[PDB]
Design an enzyme around this catalytic site. Structure first.
Site, PDB file in Angstrom:
ATOM      1  N   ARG A 145     -14.202  13.782  -4.252  1.00 26.96           N
ATOM      2  CA  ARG A 145     -15.264  13.587  -3.279  1.00 26.96           C
ATOM      3  C   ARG A 145     -14.979  14.359  -1.992  1.00 26.96           C
ATOM      4  O   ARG A 145     -15.926  14.847  -1.364  1.00 26.96           O
ATOM      5  CB  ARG A 145     -15.452  12.098  -2.955  1.00 26.96           C
ATOM      6  N   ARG A 195     -17.495   9.758   8.776  1.00 27.39           N
ATOM      7  CA  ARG A 195     -16.615  10.895   9.008  1.00 27.39           C
ATOM      8  C   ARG A 195     -17.303  12.003   9.811  1.00 27.39           C
ATOM      9  O   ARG A 195     -16.651  12.754  10.545  1.00 27.39           O
ATOM     10  CB  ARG A 195     -16.079  11.444   7.680  1.00 27.39           C
ATOM     11  N   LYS A 240      -1.774   9.280   9.954  1.00 31.52           N
ATOM     12  CA  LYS A 240      -1.802   9.831   8.607  1.00 31.52           C
ATOM     13  C   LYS A 240      -2.358  11.253   8.651  1.00 31.52           C
ATOM     14  O   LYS A 240      -1.719  12.212   8.193  1.00 31.52           O
ATOM     15  CB  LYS A 240      -2.370   8.679   7.760  1.00 31.52           C
ATOM     16  N   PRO A 257       3.064  12.009   5.542  1.00 32.61           N
ATOM     17  CA  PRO A 257       1.826  11.241   5.695  1.00 32.61           C
ATOM     18  C   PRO A 257       1.976   9.972   4.872  1.00 32.61           C
ATOM     19  O   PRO A 257       2.261  10.020   3.685  1.00 32.61           O
ATOM     20  CB  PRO A 257       0.728  12.137   5.174  1.00 32.61           C
ATOM     21  N   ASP A 259      -0.195   6.897   3.621  1.00 35.07           N
ATOM     22  CA  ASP A 259      -1.474   6.282   3.315  1.00 35.07           C
ATOM     23  C   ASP A 259      -1.168   5.190   2.295  1.00 35.07           C
ATOM     24  O   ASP A 259       0.000   4.897   2.052  1.00 35.07           O
ATOM     25  CB  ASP A 259      -2.439   7.323   2.773  1.00 35.07           C
ATOM     26  N   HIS A 261      -1.465   5.261  -0.932  1.00 32.29           N
ATOM     27  CA  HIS A 261      -0.790   5.838  -2.080  1.00 32.29           C
ATOM     28  C   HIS A 261       0.692   6.047  -1.804  1.00 32.29           C
ATOM     29  O   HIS A 261       1.468   5.831  -2.720  1.00 32.29           O
ATOM     30  CB  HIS A 261      -1.369   7.195  -2.502  1.00 32.29           C
ATOM     31  N   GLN A 278       7.659  -7.729  10.490  1.00 30.23           N
ATOM     32  CA  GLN A 278       7.495  -8.996   9.793  1.00 30.23           C
ATOM     33  C   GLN A 278       6.301  -8.876   8.849  1.00 30.23           C
ATOM     34  O   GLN A 278       6.421  -9.165   7.657  1.00 30.23           O
ATOM     35  CB  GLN A 278       7.318 -10.174  10.759  1.00 30.23           C
ATOM     36  N   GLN A 306       7.974  14.556  -0.618  1.00 31.69           N
ATOM     37  CA  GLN A 306       6.885  13.621  -0.848  1.00 31.69           C
ATOM     38  C   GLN A 306       5.764  14.303  -1.618  1.00 31.69           C
ATOM     39  O   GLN A 306       5.126  13.667  -2.444  1.00 31.69           O
ATOM     40  CB  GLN A 306       6.322  13.153   0.489  1.00 31.69           C
TER      41      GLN A 306
HETATM   42 CL1  LIG Z   1      -8.036  11.320  -0.527  1.00 31.09          CL
HETATM   43  C1  LIG Z   1      -6.568  12.142  -0.178  1.00 31.09           C
HETATM   44  C2  LIG Z   1      -6.374  13.373  -0.746  1.00 31.09           C
HETATM   45  C3  LIG Z   1      -5.216  14.062  -0.483  1.00 31.09           C
HETATM   46  C4  LIG Z   1      -4.231  13.514   0.320  1.00 31.09           C
HETATM   47  N1  LIG Z   1      -3.058  14.243   0.511  1.00 31.09           N
HETATM   48  C5  LIG Z   1      -1.725  13.852   0.738  1.00 31.09           C
HETATM   49  C6  LIG Z   1      -1.332  12.704   1.404  1.00 31.09           C
HETATM   50  C7  LIG Z   1       0.043  12.474   1.579  1.00 31.09           C
HETATM   51  N2  LIG Z   1       1.012  13.313   1.180  1.00 31.09           N
HETATM   52  C8  LIG Z   1       0.606  14.444   0.560  1.00 31.09           C
HETATM   53  N3  LIG Z   1       1.353  15.466   0.080  1.00 31.09           N
HETATM   54  N4  LIG Z   1       0.570  16.425  -0.498  1.00 31.09           N
HETATM   55  C9  LIG Z   1      -0.678  16.013  -0.365  1.00 31.09           C
HETATM   56  C10 LIG Z   1      -0.735  14.766   0.299  1.00 31.09           C
HETATM   57  C11 LIG Z   1      -4.430  12.266   0.901  1.00 31.09           C
HETATM   58  C12 LIG Z   1      -5.601  11.590   0.645  1.00 31.09           C
HETATM   59 CL2  LIG Z   1      -5.816  10.047   1.396  1.00 31.09          CL
END
Ligand SMILES: Clc1ccc(Nc2ccnc3[nH]ncc23)cc1Cl
Ligand code: NI
Length: 316
Positions: A145, A195, A240, A257, A259, A261, A278, A306
């Site tokens: 997206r 956005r 982020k 970064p 997030d 994930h 905490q 990462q």
């Molecule tokens: Cl939707 C979305 C797409 C791409 C990313 N990218 C990253 C986030 C953290 N570390 C990374 N390392 N390389 C790519 C990447 C994040 C989001 Cl939240």
């Protein structure tokens, strides 16, 4: 008229850069959420825009093959030396990935196991502008997206470069194009939701508050922590996004970064939980702590490490 090239169809038009596939795997880098501007238009051939030109890229075990379309009618030809240096810098091919993988692997057994299968994940060196607005579009979103939004953004606000087959390639707009009185409404029409406000407002803020895109270039030579803080003053830019930009466009390899994930990977695959906080879920303080954790573990190229894991977690 003009068609997307393959290495079979038009070998006259391709140049090559010596590059072991274990230093660079296009299929793990170009669509793994660093850049949103590359598509495998035909098998193993990736096409996308780099600094106002379209490229197609493909590789063998030991060579990186490329061809450039200049459009603005020139006569067709292979890439020049200068263009090839652009490409060399975009993939930061001076940096040895083998040495980095082995260093990360030596303190991190999880890494060592995943790194066997996912060689040749490296960081692109992107244009700051494109990276900022691309990652503003990344909040609450997935690669498919985001790729869609960025494409429509570039078509509507950026200069047309060329068309190949049914694909029209646009350059990334400049700040001034995104800062205009209608930009938010038009971007909403293009599906960006909230956005769209941050795109226009950040374009506006960089121009008026920071004196335009030379500021982003200054941040490239500023230290990581100063660059990160500066970016977080911008609309829709938090820790982020700022880290994405820092890592991917402002030559801060230690930026990580965090997030939902990376949270997920850290907790599941590393058993990590916030200590110096905490509150047990994501929060600004816990997110900061997780970034520090990975710097501590992996060192001053933590963000690159990462990226290997991120890219590997996108494939099953
Ligand atoms: Cl939707 C979305 C797409 C791409 C990313 N990218 C990253 C986030 C953290 N570390 C990374 N390392 N390389 C790519 C990447 C994040 C989001 Cl939240
Ligand atoms: Ni747990």
């Amino acid at each position: 008229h003009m068609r997307h090239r393959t290495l079979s169809s038009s070998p006259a038009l391709w140049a090559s850069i010596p590059c072991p596939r274990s230093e660079l795997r296009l299929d793990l880098v170009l669509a793994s959420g660093q850049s949103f501007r590359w598509k495998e238009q035909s098998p193993a051939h990736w096409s996308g825009v780099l600094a106002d030109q379209v490229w197609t890229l493909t590789q063998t075990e030991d060579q990186l093959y490329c061809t450039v379309y200049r459009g603005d009618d020139s006569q067709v030809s292979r890439p020049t030396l200068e263009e090839l240096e652009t490409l060399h810098k975009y993939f930061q091919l001076d940096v040895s990935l083998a040495q980095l993988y082995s260093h990360w692997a030596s303190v991190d057994s999880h890494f060592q196991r995943v790194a066997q299968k996912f060689q040749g994940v490296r960081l692109l060196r992107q244009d700051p502008t494109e990276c900022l607005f691309s990652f503003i579009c990344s909040s609450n979103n997935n690669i498919a997206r985001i790729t869609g939004m960025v494409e429509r953004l570039c078509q509507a606000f950026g200069p047309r470069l060329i068309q190949l087959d049914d694909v029209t390639y646009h350059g990334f707009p400049n700040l001034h194009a995104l800062a205009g009185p209608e930009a938010e409404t038009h971007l909403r029409k293009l599906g960006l939701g909230y956005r769209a406000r941050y795109v226009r407002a950040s374009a506006k803020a960089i121009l008026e508050e920071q004196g335009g895109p030379a500021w982003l270039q200054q941040l490239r030579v500023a230290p990581y922590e100063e660059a990160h803080k500066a970016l977080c003053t911008l609309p829709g830019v938090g820790a982020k996004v700022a880290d994405c930009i820092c890592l991917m466009a402002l030559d801060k390899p230690q930026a990580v970064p965090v997030d939902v994930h990376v949270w997920q990977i850290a907790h599941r695959d590393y058993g990590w939980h916030p200590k110096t906080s905490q509150a047990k879920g994501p929060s600004p303080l816990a997110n900061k702590e997780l970034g520090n954790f990975f710097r501590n573990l992996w060192g001053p190229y933590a963000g690159w490490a990462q990226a290997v894991l991120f890219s590997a977690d996108l494939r099953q």
